[PDB]
Amino acid sequence: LETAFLERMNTLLANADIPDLFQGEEYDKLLNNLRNKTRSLGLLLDTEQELYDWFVGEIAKNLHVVF
């Protein structure tokens, strides 16, 4: 509808995820959910950087956008 949609899609496609959505409370909730999923899946990650890069790898592997 408006160029902010294009900017959001551009941010999603340039990197692998949007830093805008996960800010503050949402970022903390995503960190907790990612920690729970990683512990449930069976990996040993506790630092923020490795967990977030695993999230980046997952979203790069399992998301395709067709324009």
Binding site: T3, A4, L6, E7, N10, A14, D20, Y27
Partner: protein, 1158 residues
């Protein structure tokens, strides 16, 4: 324990703020009785807050409370509204100020500080024995009240405020009546002028003048009264020089009035007939007096052109009286004509012609202080209607300066309110309705507008609104008359000839100079040169040398290079001569400050500093303009330090970039969700310096520099700040005075988009060329790099390493070479010096075990490498070979070829630096795999070396050339840097950049934006810097923000109005060449602070090599095709080259090939 001390100071400040909030709440509700019943839920909340405050105080004696106080502050909105209804003048006060003024139920001393904001001409009240006995105007004159006003503990603010408001008019009328009785007794005005308040003498003299003129006009003689008036003026001028400063100002205003009287008498005497005399008597303003009215505050009325107005008898103090030009009289007549039918007088014309001052003079002649507002783009319908309903209840005259600045929708919407106000004044309505609420309507109020047509970015008046106004043009002011009477009143021996000379000189200077945009020599420059010639009389004396020195000090810094010669020739040919000022102490202070800061005191820089000091000696707002990197920041910083040394006054500076913040964050924004006002950044600074809680801002100069382009929408909201009003007018009615020590500077590069309204109103300082020598600049950079860090021996030898005689010739010959991202060589010395110093400081740990010849040769090789990669570091291949050949020519020294590089401690090349790669089959899916070539390893080494030098690196090249590729290769193998990926678009904001760093940084107060890692730096990689688009006035938000983050090493936080300091964040950017379609040019003010590199397309042979390694690694899968790895690589390279050559961009907009396709 610096962090602990900062935490303790912050806790103390928060405790003080909480104590102030609780004091206000206790004053409004917690102390006064029978006040809880208005709002019971708010009363219970106040009781709970009182319990919380008592618990907090007990805990402190032995956060959440602040949040609760902020939540309950919104519950006081209707109480504040009804309190403002109780006293109409509270609409000029802020909500916190209104809390302070209501809660002070027994102190009765908080009122004096806010009375300047309320009344506009009174800043203090004399108190004795808990009673009001004296009122003091802004000029220090004390008005004795007619009757002392008693104060009780029970009475709150508004009742005694209303009593004081009535007593002000009563005392002014009593003093006027006594002065008029004394004048009718026949005494001279020289004894009267030292007795009463100035307004009494002024209006009584006007009444006597019009009565005696009428008496003489009944007959046909004028010589007797003309002689009497002339002798009165001469006696007053004789009395001027032997009295106090307050009496001096009063006498000056009396001379203005009596000189206007003499002008009118001279106009009437030269008449022949009687009809023309009656015409000129009818046109001029007359001050009659009612003889039969038993009322006392309406006994004097003003007649002009047959119309009548009522004197409000409001205290005005001593203002700066305006010289009565004929245009001023015609404007007064048209305002009287507009006000006879309760319409609105409108003034329009070119800027700097005397419109707002004319309205203020009319209001002072009618004896009511005129409140002035500055219309802005943030003024929507709600705030404008609030200001209108505020000024209708008060009855004071509102003057909406720059009425064109409003949005056209708001201009159409306010038409109904304006017509309603006019009709209510016409029909004498007791109440009018605005904002869906009935309010009383005073029968004294009126509205004026001063629009400025013909300037870009300004909407036009819709006709339903313009029909409700009377517009009058002010095209040609009478500058000669103003100059003549002002020179006469300052006591100059010759006045008429001097005024004619200065006006004709200004006209000749305007006509016979290089006609560019920023030249304007109208009335504002004349007023400025007179205000600068006023204090020079102590060191020079009244005459011609004073006025020529004032003309020089006002005009010369604003001229170019040849225009200075034209100005000097004109001043020599129109005036007699030019004893010069000694200026020994100030130049000694400047030289000491320059030696302390390491700058070189060249003739041009010293002249610019002298001009800046002499301009700022009386001018309050200055604008510094010139090319990029002339030295404006250095100039004003070193003159601030020199001033601090000279005067002993402490100096604090606030560096604000105007285009990096929105208007709602700079000046403020009204939260529509709760109808509450949030202060911006500049408003917060002004409020902090005006309130002066700490007490240390009284004897300290305050400087605010605006280090960005002069956007009209961002700077024309300061129209009422920079001019003679010196009042900031917020949308919510707050009126912040500007202290005399508050000074504003401007720092930009162009004045094409600026307007003459904000050019004339500020002092100007044009930088024709650079201020410093290139060798002196290199010496300064070396000094700062040495101070940034045996050591003395190393510094001496590296200083002896430079040979500036060949360096300046190399710099002058470097201009023939082609460049991208067009920047002058004067800016590129920073990267050269910093790279050389960093390299020597890094290699000094192996510089203690070799001979001097090898050391000198190695250092000269490093200097050659730094100079090459700085001056020609953003060039093509053949250009780089040409420049390395040139620098080898211009320096016995160690030879440096296209591939010369030190090895870890001798000379080598990249022939032996290529490592063999065992590229396995399954590793081609990793995007980070690199095939090292000559250019790849060279670019990676220089990129890592530049990034280790604590600088900014901008990598340029065609798309797909390998910019982020070599950056990832360089920063991947290093365990000290982290890479963050930010990609820009057509609309990227500062909030996006801050949001992409929130998950990578941590906020710590000491503010400071540290990286999350305590050992690894962070490299802010902003890709595609050219993509963020311009706004409608030639500026870029993101590029200016990055320039702020690189030079000032910080930025201003928007929602908290606090400065942060960056510590361990490096800025690295990538951009396509500007000639690429879709890409846009970028300012030199940002490329000055960063080094630029070219990353071109590799040669076709290099592509064939890297892709035959790729094809061997890909044919490791199938072993019987190992001999065909090269034909496929050659076919792929040839196909890519032919596809690029055939399908160009001119066919389709997306035919942009790259090695990424391969």
């Amino acid at each position: 324990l610096e962090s602990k001390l900062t935490k303790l100071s912050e806790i103390q400040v928060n405790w003080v703020e909480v104590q102030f909030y609780w004091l206000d709440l206790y004053g409004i509700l917690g102390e006064n009785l029978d006040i809880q019943n208005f709002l019971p839920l708010e009363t219970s909340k106040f009781k709970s807050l009182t319990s919380e405050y008592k618990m907090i105080t007990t805990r402190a004696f032995q956060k959440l409370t602040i949040d609760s106080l902020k939540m309950i502050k919104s519950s006081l909105s209707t109480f504040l509204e009804r309190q403002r209804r109780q006293f109409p003048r509270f609409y000029f006060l802020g909500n916190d100020d209104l809390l302070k003024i209501i809660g002070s139920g027994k102190h009765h001393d908080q009122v004096s500080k806010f009375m300047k904001k309320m009344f506009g001409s009174i800043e203090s009240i004399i108190f004795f024995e808990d009673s009001i006995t004296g009122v003091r105007s802004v000029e220090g004159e004390v008005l004795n009240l007619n009757e002392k006003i008693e104060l009780k503990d029970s009475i709150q603010a508004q009742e005694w405020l209303n009593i004081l408001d009535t007593e002000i008019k009563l005392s002014v009328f009593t003093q006027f009546r006594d002065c008029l009785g004394q004048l009718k007794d026949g005494t001279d005005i020289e004894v009267v002028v030292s007795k009463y308040i100035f307004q009494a003498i002024l209006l009584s003299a006007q009444v006597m003048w019009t009565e005696l003129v009428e008496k003489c006009l009944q007959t046909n003689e004028f010589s007797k009264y003309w002689k009497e008036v002339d002798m009165k003026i001469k006696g007053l001028l004789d009395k001027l020089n032997k009295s106090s400063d307050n009496v001096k100002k009063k006498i000056e205003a009396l001379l203005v009035e009596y000189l206007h009287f003499n002008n009118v008498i001279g106009q009437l005497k030269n008449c022949s007939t009687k009809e023309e005399a009656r015409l000129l008597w009818a046109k001029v303003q007359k001050f009659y007096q009612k003889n039969d009215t038993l009322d006392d505050l309406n006994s004097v009325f003003i007649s002009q052109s047959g119309y009548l107005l009522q004197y409000k008898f409001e205290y005005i103090g001593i203002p700066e009286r305006l010289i009565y030009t004929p245009l001023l009289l015609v404007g007064f007549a048209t305002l009287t004509d507009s006000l006879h039918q309760k319409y609105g007088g409108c003034f329009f014309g070119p800027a700097g012609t005397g419109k707002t001052e004319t309205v203020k003079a009319f209001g002072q002649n009618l004896g009511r202080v005129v409140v002035v507002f500055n219309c802005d783009d943030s003024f929507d319908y709600q705030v404008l209607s609030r200001l209108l309903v505020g000024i209708t209840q008060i009855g004071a005259w509102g003057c909406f300066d720059e009425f064109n600045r409003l949005d056209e929708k708001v201009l159409s919407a306010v038409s109904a309110n304006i017509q309603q106000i006019q009709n209510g004044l016409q029909v004498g309505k007791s109440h009018i309705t605005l904002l869906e609420e009935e309010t009383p309507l005073s029968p004294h109020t009126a509205v004026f507008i001063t629009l400025n047509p013909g300037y870009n970015g300004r909407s036009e008046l819709p006709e339903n609104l313009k029909k409700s106004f009377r517009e009058f043009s002010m095209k040609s002011p009478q500058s000669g008359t103003i100059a003549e009477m002002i020179l006469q009143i300052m006591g100059f021996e010759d006045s008429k000839s001097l005024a004619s000379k200065i006006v004709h000189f200004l006209e000749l200077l305007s006509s016979k100079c290089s006609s560019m945009n920023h030249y304007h020599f109208g009335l504002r420059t004349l007023k400025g040169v007179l205000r600068n010639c006023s204090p020079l009389v102590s060191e020079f004396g009244e005459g011609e040398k004073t006025v020529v020195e004032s003309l020089k000090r006002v005009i010369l810094p604003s001229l170019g290079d040849t225009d200075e010669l034209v100005f000097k020739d004109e001043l020599s040919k129109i005036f007699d001569s030019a004893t010069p000022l000694n200026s020994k102490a100030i130049v000694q202070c400047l030289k000491d400050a320059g030696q302390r800061s390491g700058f070189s005191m060249s003739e041009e820089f010293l002249k610019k500093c002298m001009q800046f000091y002499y301009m700022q000696k009386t001018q309050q707002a200055l604008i510094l303009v010139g090319k990029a990197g002339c030295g404006k920041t250095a100039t004003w910083k070193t003159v601030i330090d020199a001033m601090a040394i000279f005067d002993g006054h402490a100096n604090v500076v606030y560096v604000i970039d105007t285009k990096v913040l929105t208007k709602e964050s700079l000046y403020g924004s009204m939260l529509k969700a709760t109808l509450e006002w949030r202060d911006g950044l500049f408003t917060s600074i002004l409020r902090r310096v005006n309130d002066d809680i700490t007490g240390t801002f009284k004897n300290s100069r305050i400087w605010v520099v605006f280090d960005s382009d002069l956007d009209p929408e961002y700077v024309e909201a300061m129209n009422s700040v920079l001019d003679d009003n010196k009042i900031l007018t917020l949308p919510n009615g707050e009126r912040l005075p500007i202290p005399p020590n508050f000074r504003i500077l401007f720092e930009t590069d162009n004045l094409d988009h600026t307007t003459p309204a904000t050019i004339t109103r500020c002092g100007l300082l044009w930088f024709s060329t650079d201020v410093c020598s290139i060798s002196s600049k290199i010496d300064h950079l070396l000094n700062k790099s040495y101070e940034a860090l045996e050591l003395d021996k190393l510094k001496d030898l590296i200083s002896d390493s430079f040979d500036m005689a060949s360096l300046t010739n190399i710099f002058t010959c470097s201009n023939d070479l082609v460049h991208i991202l067009g920047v002058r060589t004067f800016n590129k010395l920073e990267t050269a010096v910093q790279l050389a110093v960093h390299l020597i400081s890094s290699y000094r740990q192996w510089f203690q075990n070799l001979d001097d010849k090898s050391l000198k040769d190695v250092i000269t090789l490093l200097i050659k490498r730094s100079l090459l990669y700085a001056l020609a570091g953003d060039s093509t291949g053949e250009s780089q070979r040409a420049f390395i050949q040139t620098i080898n020519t211009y320096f016995d020294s160690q030879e440096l070829s296209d591939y010369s590089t030190i090895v870890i401690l001798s000379f080598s090349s990249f022939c032996s630096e290529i490592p063999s790669v065992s590229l396995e089959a399954h590793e081609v899916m990793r995007p980070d795999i690199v095939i090292p070539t000559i250019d790849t390893i060279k670019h990676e080494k220089i990129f890592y070396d530049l990034l280790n030098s604590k600088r900014g690196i901008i990598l340029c090249g065609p798309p797909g050339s390998g910019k982020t590729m070599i950056m990832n290769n360089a920063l991947r193998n290093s365990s000290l840097y982290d890479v963050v990926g930010i990609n820009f678009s057509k609309d990227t904001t500062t909030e996006h950049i801050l949001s992409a760093l929130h998950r990578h940084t941590n906020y710590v107060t000491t503010l400071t934006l540290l990286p999350k890692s305590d050992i690894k730096n962070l490299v802010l990689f902003c890709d595609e810097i050219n993509l963020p688009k311009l706004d409608k006035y030639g500026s870029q938000n993101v590029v200016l923000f990055l320039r702020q983050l690189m030079e000032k090493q910080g930025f201003w936080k928007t929602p908290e109005n606090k400065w942060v300091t960056i510590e361990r964040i490096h800025i690295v950017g990538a951009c396509n060449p500007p000639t690429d379609p879709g890409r846009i040019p970028m300012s030199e003010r940002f490329t000055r602070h960063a080094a630029i590199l070219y990353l071109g397309y590799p040669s076709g042979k290099s592509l064939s090599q890297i892709y035959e390694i790729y094809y061997k690694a890909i044919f490791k899968l199938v072993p019987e095709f190992r001999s065909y790895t090269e034909p496929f690589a050659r076919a792929s390279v040839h196909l890519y080259n032919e596809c690029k050559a055939r399908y160009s961009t001119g066919l389709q907009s997306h035919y942009l090939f790259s090695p990424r396709e391969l």
